[PDB]
Paper text:
In the mevalonate pathway, the [name] (MDD, EC: 4.1.1.33) is a rate-limiting enzyme, suggesting that inhibition of MDD could eliminate the products of the mevalonate pathway and accordingly shut down bacterial growth. The γ-phosphate group of ATP is transferred to MVAPP to make the 3′-phosphate-MVAPP intermediate, which is then subjected to dephosphorylation and decarboxylation to produce IPP. In this study, we utilized MDD from [name] V583 ([name]), a VRE strain, and investigated the enzyme from structural, functional and biophysical points of view. Our present results suggest that the substrate-binding mechanism of MDDs involves programmed conformational rearrangements in and around the active site, including movements of the β10-α4 loop, the phosphate-binding loop, and three helices, α1, α2, and α4.
The apo form of [name] ([name]-SO42−) has almost identical secondary structure elements compared with other MDDs. Other MVAPP-bound MDDs have stabilized phosphate-binding loops possibly due to crystal contacts directly involving this loop or the C-terminal insertion covering the corresponding β-strands in eukaryotic MDDs. In contrast to all other published structures, in the [name] structures, there is no crystal contact in the regions described above, which should allow the flexible loops to take up unrestricted conformations. In the physical mechanism, the phosphate-binding loop and the β10-α4 loop may be initially dynamic or disordered in an apo structure (left).
Author numbering:
A (entry chain A), B (entry chain A): 0 to 97, 104 to 182, 193 to 326
The structure:
Amino acid sequence: AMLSGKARAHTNIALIKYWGKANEEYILPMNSSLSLTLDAFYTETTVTFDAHYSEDVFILNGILQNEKQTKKVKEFLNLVRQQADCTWFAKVESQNFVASSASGLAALAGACNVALGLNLSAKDLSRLARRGSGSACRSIFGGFAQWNKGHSDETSFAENIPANNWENELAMLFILIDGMKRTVETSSFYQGWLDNVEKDLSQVHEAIKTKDFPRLGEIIEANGLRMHGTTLGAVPPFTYWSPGSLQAMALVRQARAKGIPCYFTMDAGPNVKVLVEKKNLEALKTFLSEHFSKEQLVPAFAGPGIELFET
Amino acid sequence: AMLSGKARAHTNIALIKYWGKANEEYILPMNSSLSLTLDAFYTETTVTFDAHYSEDVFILNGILQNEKQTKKVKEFLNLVRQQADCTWFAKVESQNFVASSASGLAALAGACNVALGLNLSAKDLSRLARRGSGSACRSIFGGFAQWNKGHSDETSFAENIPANNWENELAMLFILIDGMKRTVETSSFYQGWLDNVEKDLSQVHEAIKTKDFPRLGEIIEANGLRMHGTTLGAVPPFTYWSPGSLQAMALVRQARAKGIPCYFTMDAGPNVKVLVEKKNLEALKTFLSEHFSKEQLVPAFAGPGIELFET
């Protein structure tokens, strides 16, 4: 008496940021977001629901996860079990291949979809993954994907953005180096963030249509910096940046000054991701090898959407 | 046929920032600001107006200044000459003792006041110095000073803030490591800056009245960070910070975590200034000597207002 399933999901980098929740219970965002799914980073997850299991068990990269490390997986298992009326405890085994939490929750959503026979469409699998993490709902799709904020659980989900395979000409170079809710609630800059998101989304779409890289890069770099500005207006104010983040951002500006179009974006931690055309990736690595070690510069290209496996 | 005068003016650190101009010609600010005048840093300036001079000459620390280095001094000389109906070229000799541009313009304003016999009140000398630089108008005064934005040339000036000599219990530790107009005009965060200034000023005044140091420190640290957030919303966005600025800010937070009340503020360059009570200054220097050299840690205490000298 057991049900099992497996999925592989790739991480994604938000180019137009998901920043702030309108609804905490359902993970409905304050604004729509847009990402690029990446080939280099992914999670493979297997789930087993078995009447003989006595508790939920989460193993990540061979290591048994403790309660706090299992908290998001357990809450997702409860959600999908309640949706399926399944009364069994589960064993989740994930292996990261190297944002990972998000790819992991996307993979778990697909694995549970398989195991419980939910037969979900891509849209409804995105809606399910959304309940685990917002970024996870975009990793259901490959290449460029947009999470549409929606007004509700039914209308908030992600879809792929057809680029005419422009995504296959791009690359990301990773430079290895409570706050969101605080910012929504207390930051005097949050409204300015909200007022600029839709214009940014529109111009990304116009840039994708014309394959205009400098336009794409300028928009997404300013979008990321606008997100980071908001935390300096929160009460109390904070930054996600580390000294190395600033060094890396300044070096990307230097790179552009030498005629390499490239553009940086950051998330909720100090690392810096650089968008560049495939042509210039190695030149950028060499330039940044002046101030950072080989182990700190990691390339990635466009990746696929979620892959489901019957067990 | 010559007229001469001399003044000494001390620099000041803005605790509630002057950020943005309402009027560029008259230097009327978008908001009121509040500073502490410091003992350690000052400029002494002598001016001579002489019918025999053939051009304006500016010597700074013994070195003849070129045209671009003389631009602000020359514009100030023209302003004060037009106000006095004086047709003579001038020789300005300034010596920095070690923000310096601002202390230098305050000192020049006092020296011209003496030389041309303007017999200005402190208020009117502040109004004159304001035409050279906004910060200069506060350095007319010692200790705590507030530049009231006013609506006009007549109403925009600075005044000392009586503290019951609380300023003599404080200290600043300096850690040595176009954008303003761009931010006013393009930043989606500038209105949030404006909406929070007056509340900050009110609480500084309440803190001074009760000599409440943690309250003063919390307000001014958040005020500075709010100013810096606005530049990340400018078009194009930018930061004044350098990697070392972030390291220093993080170390100040660590210092507080160990029970040393202290609070950081930054201006338009990478250096970091730390407000602390006199009692703890040396402890802070020792703590920061872990990551910075002796030449990078410079203490200062409360300084006096402008001093005028007949020549």
